[PDB]
């Protein structure tokens, strides 16, 4: 299937409590593999998956130097954004940044990303052509004009289309058993009474990887999108994921409903009924 | 646009002393760089900084140190540990550490084992040959600056009280008078060519001026001869029919 | 990383075109820049190139880029004395520092309209008994060599008398030895056959 590598950076100012806290993490697909925390004692990029510990000291030295430079840049940005929005020094604020790349089934480049938010809201993003920028508001326009005049995109496009893809390919090969795997969900269904004339049917999917999954309910073969409660897919903590979907049915009509499960690890979708 | 500056243009120190070279830029650049160049060789990267509060070693960092407390400044310290401090030192900057860099004017740093090796230049002007005037109707004056160390000199020609550039050629670099020996004293030559009629006017005044950069007040001097401090040494000649 | 420039140095006559090469890594290319570095000045950026096959031009200067094989050529048409300089090439990758080559040093020899080669003796203005010899007005085919003695000889230098549209080469020899005379000062150089040696 397709794959992706994504890096996520968060910097939070803390008025009256010192320099901002910076946390960085990297993912291949739904598997985390590195982190950096400006508040931790190590002051190093650290492994968070067994397969990345195969990299030697030069890799860890180099990733530490680079992420420390990221840390200081986003520290400056917090001060810059405070000025752009004419904010006081009293409030805590957050800068977020994500970048990375997608590849298809041939592991060839498919798409690149590089985008920012300030206080949970879109700030500036590199467009899909990897040549122009989307500026959320008037303050992001200042950044856009600066990055255009400086040719930032032409340099980023070399990373997103080239270097990023090379690293992803390398990681997929070196973490084959973990990353090029598919775990089909284990499924079952539960039944609870809501009132004396109504019941909840909850359809479960467990122990599946990757996180992408679809659960839908049907009544007499007809989708029930409006009356279906979904929960956010959640990690079990061992590398697999969990999810459920529920529907309230009139008691005694449980036989009219079917749950349908689609996952990359299933040869065909599953249909589940209440027994 | 702003600019990037370095100071001072010439530095001279006794071996074993630490010295810090200044580099400042109001170009709004985040990335700054330090290079050294030896005569005949290329640039060699000493240290760089991509952002305030971050610096990383180059290929020849041993004996050097930097700080980057402020975006606008990137000072380089040459510690006693540096084995061959004497070199030309260039600072540079760029918006974000990709694409073209912008270089400051550079600092020439010389260190010596002994301070008694410092000598100011002697300057002499040699007047045009009468054979030249008759053969070509032009007249070449030659200035010689000789016996100075370090090779930190700036030479200029002054005609009737105003510095001149037309008809002037100065050697690109001083020549060592005892090449095998180091440290050794240097010499430098320059020529000014004018019309014969212009040289034959006794109202015209020609002057060769050598600015020499040497010792300061802090340096201690117990030697017999005059203290070889920074000074201007000059020689002059007048036109003659 | 390794950036290789060639040749190390080269000499061309004013008006002739020239070109030199920069060889750089064939993988993970992010940008190439060219600089001009004149004597008594600092490097000044001429071109930045990122697109394979693109051609850049400024004045009489131009550059091409081939990222597949890792080559860039710099061309100067109708070269002028002002073009004399060291030209540097630099290579960017996924990093915050560029890799600089060691440079190509170009010397453009000026055209000399009417050569009149000669060796003149000049007298000091103040202190007596001092003198130098001035070899002057030779064309650019002449090369000046150092002496085989403790005699001092400077390299060829070009001065420009702007208002008269006139340029001339010269070299200076001096010494305080008893044998040193202008007749013999430049003996270690191959001098023009018709070089003028003024009588007494």
């Amino acid at each position: 299937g397709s794959h992706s590598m994504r890096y996520f950076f968060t910097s939070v100012s803390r008025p009256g409590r010192g320099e901002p806290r910076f946390i960085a993490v990297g993912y291949v697909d739904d598997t985390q593999f590195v982190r950096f925390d400006s508040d931790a004692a190590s002051q190093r990029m650290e492994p968070r998956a067994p397969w990345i510990e195969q990299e030697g000291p030069e890799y860890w030295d180099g990733e530490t130097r680079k992420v420390k430079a990221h840390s200081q840049t986003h520290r400056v940005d917090l001060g810059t954004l405070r000025g752009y929005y004419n904010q006081s020094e009293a409030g805590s604020h957050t800068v977020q940044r994500m970048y990375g790349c997608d590849v298809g089934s041939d592991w060839r480049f498919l798409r690149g990303y590089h985008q920012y938010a300030y206080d949970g809201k879109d700030y500036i993003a590199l467009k899909e052509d990897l040549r122009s920028w989307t500026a959320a508001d008037m303050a992001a326009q200042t950044t856009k004009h600066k990055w255009e005049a400086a040719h930032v995109a032409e340099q980023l496009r070399a990373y997103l289309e080239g270097t990023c893809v090379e690293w992803l390919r390398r990681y997929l090969e070196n973490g084959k058993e973990t990353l090029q795997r598919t775990d089909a969900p284990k499924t079952h269904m539960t039944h609870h009474a809501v009132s004396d004339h109504e019941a909840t049917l909850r359809c479960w999917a467990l122990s599946f990887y990757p996180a992408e999954i679809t659960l839908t309910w049907q009544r007499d073969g007809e989708d029930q999108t409006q009356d279906t409660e979904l929960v956010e897919t959640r990690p079990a903590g061992d590398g697999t994921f969990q999810k459920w979907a529920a529907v309230v049915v009139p008691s005694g009509q449980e036989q009219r409903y079917t749950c349908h499960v689609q996952h990359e690890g299933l040869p065909k979708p599953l249909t589940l009924r209440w027994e | 646009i702003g600019g990037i500056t370095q100071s001072p243009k010439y530095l001279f120190r006794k071996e074993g002393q630490n010295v810090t070279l200044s580099c400042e830029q109001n170009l709004n650049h985040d990335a700054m760089y330090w290079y050294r160049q030896d005569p005949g060789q290329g640039l060699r990267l000493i240290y760089y900084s991509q952002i305030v509060n971050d610096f990383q070693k180059g290929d020849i960092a041993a004996g050097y140190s930097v700080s980057r407390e402020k975006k606008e400044s990137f000072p380089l310290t040459v510690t006693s540990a540096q084995k061959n401090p004497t070199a030309f030192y260039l600072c540079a900057s760029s918006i974000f550490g990709q694409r073209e860099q912008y270089f400051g004017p550079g600092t020439r740093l010389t260190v010596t084992e002994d301070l008694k090796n410092v000598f100011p230049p002697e300057v002499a002007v040699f007047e045009p040959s009468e054979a030249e005037i008759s053969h070509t109707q032009k007249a070449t004056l030659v200035c010689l600056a000789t016996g100075f160390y370090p090779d930190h000199v700036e030479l200029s020609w002054w005609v009737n009280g105003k510095e001149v550039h037309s008809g002037v050629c100065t050697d690109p670099q001083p020549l060592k008078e005892q090449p095998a020996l180091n440290d050794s004293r240097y010499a430098l030559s320059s020529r000014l060519r004018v019309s014969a009629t212009f040289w034959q006017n006794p109202r015209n005044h020609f002057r060769c001026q050598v600015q020499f950069y040497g010792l300061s007040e802090n340096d201690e001097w117990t030697q017999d001869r005059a203290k070889p401090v920074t000074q201007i040494v000059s020689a002059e000649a007048w036109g003659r029919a | 990383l390794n950036v290789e420039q060639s040749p190390q140095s080269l000499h061309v006559q004013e008006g002739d075109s020239t070109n030199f090469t920069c060889s750089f890594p064939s993988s993970n290319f992010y940008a190439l820049h060219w600089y001009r570095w004149e004597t008594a000045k600092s490097p000044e950026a001429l071109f930045v190139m990122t697109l394979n096959g693109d051609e850049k031009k400024k004045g009489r200067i131009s550059a091409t880029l081939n990222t597949k094989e890792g080559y860039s050529y710099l061309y100067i048409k109708g070269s002028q004395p002002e073009d004399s300089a060291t030209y540097l090439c630099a290579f960017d990758t996924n990093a915050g520092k560029s890799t600089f080559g060691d440079g190509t040093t170009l010397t453009v020899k000026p055209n000399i309209q009417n050569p009149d080669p000669a060796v003149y003796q000049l007298r000091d203005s103040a202190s007596s008994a001092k003198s130098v010899c001035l070899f002057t007005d030779f064309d650019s085919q002449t090369n000046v060599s150092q002496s085989k003695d403790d005699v001092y000889i400077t390299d060829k230098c070009v001065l420009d008398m702007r208002s008269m549209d006139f340029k001339s080469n010269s070299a200076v020899a001096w010494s305080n030895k008893s044998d040193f005379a202008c007749a013999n000062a430049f003996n270690n150089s191959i001098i023009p056959e018709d070089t003028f040696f003024p009588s007494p």
Partner: peptide, 9 residues
């Protein structure tokens, strides 16, 4: 591997 260069907003 992450970006090797950085730029301010």
């Amino acid at each position: 591997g992450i970006l090797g260069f950085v730029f301010t907003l």
